[PDB]
């Protein structure tokens, strides 16, 4: 098998191809293992599941397919895009045997030993893609990556299982046994999905009217009027124009919301206390609380409030080399969803206000903030943006009902997503006893596998057709001089992605 | 071009044709102008946009097409209707030059000078139809009307623009140049849309059951029972019949709600204070509050509460000659959406009640009102009625998502609505200098244009098929004598619409 | 004639269309005039030439054709571009007569009176396009512009002419006489020229 | 806002005739398009005069002009990995939008815009 990475832009399609080198260890020393949360974990953190000897291939991030330059080409020139089909290949398989004896490691090729590969194309296994896990094909084509281990969760009561808990043995599926010189290929067609909106609106939902012309409709503009030395209740009505534009009758409503706490990138603005959980937005499922992250698509901040972001309401990526645990804000890249504030409520403020009572002579009108607003007829909204380093698709859970199944971390909801591609080194027993033993074999030859993997995805484009007169916004590299070029290697060969790149640069009217 | 107004009723279709005479001044003295809110405006009222020299034709009100008698014919005989296609014409164009000299105005026809016309049929301009603006074809065919000026809004930060703000020059579109003796025509096909519900339900969602037959299901009918000289907790259950009808198990839920303050048409019932804004129902978008008007479809009042209406929850039309600002209630016509109270919550009361706690021996059950209820599975609702003097369609905003896009002021949500029809007088420079000057011309011949416009719309009807035995409600003129006939001219030639007329007279079961 | 401004991007071509309104005075009160530098001008500034009653159309600036947004589209996405062909039109001609009498100006349309138009397609006149003069179609389509006056220079010795100096009378060319309701059109094909380099080198 | 073409002077020799103000050197450029109002004499004397007429009706002309140009493009095919430079409008708020009209209707071009944003190797 040959090496193919490039992008092919033709008409309204762009074909991306990526090739990487991978290495697959033996996981679990070939065993399936029951796993669960520690005895001391909080109820919110309990789980029960299985670890398996299998690995899996994950290309569920945009930078597995688009170079930074390709991404720029995409986002500056198109109002929409969406996956069409893909071709996946494993080739140049090599199985290597390791011998550690007497202090010295000696790796030797074993042309005969196999790896096993199958796609779960009937979606019979727990689908763990679409959880934003590490282990995807790396963004830089020269980086070699380890194939991540497949494990899954089932129902739990505390750290224990329940009757409904399921156990899957992956060897109960047919799989291809691949030797050196064997290749694995399959093709996949995406179901029809809406184009992702790679634009920002240039109008706000509350300013769709002609500012020059009054409405023929009236609104209640005054509830009382001067009487002698005092007021008297009098209802009075006006036709809204430009000057009272907030009062105009309108056809639509902003998108739903589920309110997030606001935190500041300026450390001093924040309360000195531990609220990351107690202040967090959450959902409550079967007695357990889970963080709602990133949650419903809501604008990250209002005008001129760049420093603020919702506590759990934005994707946050690590800078190159950032550690796992409690890194400072300078170690992460916080995405900003401000482009959708034309339609979607700001994540950190109320949806609006509703009346709570019935006013009368002795009772004044009362209102209350609305901090969670489910969908209402007439609402419109934008989904969360996608990012070069962000996820692509998610499997829509198989359920009686769902609403607007755009996966909340962003990307394309798929009923039949790209199937899980499972792989494992076939165990090779070491020297057996010459007396029969019924015990299952526990001594195996140490080995691992390596090879190349390629994934080709055809994307459909919706070309920008802007009729605006003035230039628009475009993603651009900096002109100024610098020690390192953005999206390159440094002097040590480390590739890095210095910033998140969304898709929403071009604009469109509502 | 000839004059065509009439209505043609054939089978399940009614074709409406309207012809009017229009006059188009020169707007902005041919200039595009940046416009914005005043420096002193509240944040809620800020805007940024452009005024253009162009005018536009707007027939987006039912009375542009239906005579009062036609409307009666429609609403008394049909359970539903919806637009199918339309034909639009401009003809008998006349361009007139005005000369004001020496005190005396002299208007002269200029057969050569042109008007420019284009439809935005690709929807590349900000769409300002569907904001309930004035300037539509007038209801009475003998009234001559001024073509309104086209302007639009884009993003703003206070009174300033932002990078994403867009500027549209309409001359960057192809347009037909029309002279005297030229006509402009185009045809348009409505996309499939649901029939408007021109009926009222004769059943309420909470009374769908057979009153004669008990349910086989049980509900919790008592939580405690007499014990010796005192009570003891005991759960007890009953099958609901007619006598406990409120308790029956049911399959459906009333429509969503977003609660409105209640105001009375009787002045004395109202609080003496200014609550028209502070008490108002609103949404909150990018740091700005906007009145929610008319908002989600909700019944205006409950049984026998005719005098009450939601503060911003009903369309309100002016009586003939009513002024723009702070008119008394006697100057306006307040619509009433009581017909939908069979399914949709009353706009001024709570959706219902939910439990807020977990009762036990030492803790009593607690409930709270629900003043905003987003959509739930099993909900059903009616959309707001349409009115003879009300809007017809609105453009569904171009967004990732929307829910039930029936425009909240009423009418038909269209992805591809009737296109904006833009027109302007071609500037004709006045006498130029005989020495070359690079400056753009600022001296033009004064002129205006006039002509006729006709719009033909074919409507599809869903004929009433009532199997009820007793007569039903029908819209009827008064029998009694009066000084003026409703929906006529007075002695001064002024046409007036004395009342709003909805569509919901006939009834149907749920 | 109808109004056409838009840009059409297809494959490896972009078609730009611009329409403007223009006004043409009477230049030189219909006369040809000899012109020259002032007597006091420096030798470096001397010239000799002719002013003519004719005007001319000049679209020799990019913003006559590309909107700013179009230009952005061009320069962000292409390594090169070059003109291929063009179509030019004059239409909706109106000839207006002005009467200034007794203090009052009255402008009246004259449907019969003509304008004369010709293209110098054999390049027999002094070619004054390409000198970066003002008077081109303005960048913003709603601006109305004055047609600039045609004049040219020939050889001079100081402010005087020489034997080799040439004089061109433009009425010695055939020209179309255009009335109200007449249109003028012609098409033109650019010769092959190198693509303009719409890139910067990333190497020195 | 700059020039497009220039006529290459008709000469025995020239070298690299790219016009120095920029744009395309053309041997046969777009032709000059000349226009003038036909003179209309005012009321003549009723006695014959050989003198050329010097009294004319004041007049001017107006109309529309359209120009359509087809341009050929050489599409960017950059194989560089990192993003490149692109012409972009400013994001920040401002009183006027660049390349628009102001409150008085005056259009303005706030900056020159060249063509050289994308890059290529030598």
Author numbering:
A (entry chain B), B (entry chain J): 226 to 735
C (entry chain I): 226 to 429
D (entry chain I): 614 to 735
Manuscript excerpt for this entry:
The AAV2L336C variant is of particular biological interest, as it is defective in genome packaging and is associated with reduced infectivity.
The final map of AAV2L336C had a global resolution of 1.86 Å, with a largely homogeneous local resolution distribution within the core of the capsid shell that drops to ≥1.92 Å at the solvent-exposed surfaces. Using this map, an atomic model was derived for the common region of the VP monomer, residues 226 to 735 (VP1 numbering), which was symmetry expanded by icosahedral matrix multiplication to produce the full 60-mer viral capsid. There is a 1.4 Å shift of the main-chain of C336 and neighboring residues, compared to AAV2WT. The AAV2L336C variant displays a 2–3-fold defect in genome packaging compared to AAV2WT and lacks PLA2 activity resulting in a defect in infectivity.
